[PDB]
């Protein structure tokens, strides 16, 4: 009941990070302030698919 999700930089769309998240516990759309190395600046990353 745990899936591998990918955190995507909002303003570039690059899949910068991958992480684990438990489905059937929140089924929300996890957002995380992560550092986007393309921009040398922190920004918002959203949950998304892997494949």
């Amino acid at each position: 009941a745990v899936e591998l999700i990918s955190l995507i930089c909002e303003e570039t769309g690059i899949r910068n990070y991958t992480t684990t998240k438990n489905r059937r516990n929140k089924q929300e759309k996890l957002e995380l302030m992560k550092y986007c190395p393309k921009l040398r600046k922190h920004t918002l990353h959203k949950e998304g698919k892997i494949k």
Binding site: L4, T18, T19, T20
Partner: protein, 66 residues
């Protein structure tokens, strides 16, 4: 020419020789499931390494020309 020693191709495709003996190679475990592995572990696995001096003689036998 009748009997030139054949190189071991599967070894050629993985080993490299430095100028004065050492052998360069690519580290393992950075090919596959990667989410769980820590970032510093992955960063160290990316950078290439040198083999221990104990394998160099066998490798020099495997790569007779390279």
């Amino acid at each position: 020419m009748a009997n030139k020693m054949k190189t071991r191709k599967s070894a050629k495709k993985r080993y490299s020789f430095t100028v004065n003996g050492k052998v360069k190679y690519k580290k393992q475990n950075l090919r596959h499931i990667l989410t769980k592995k820590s970032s510093k572990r992955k960063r160290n696995l990316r950078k290439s390494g040198n083999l221990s001096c104990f394998e160099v003689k066998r490798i020099k036998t495997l790569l007779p020309y390279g």
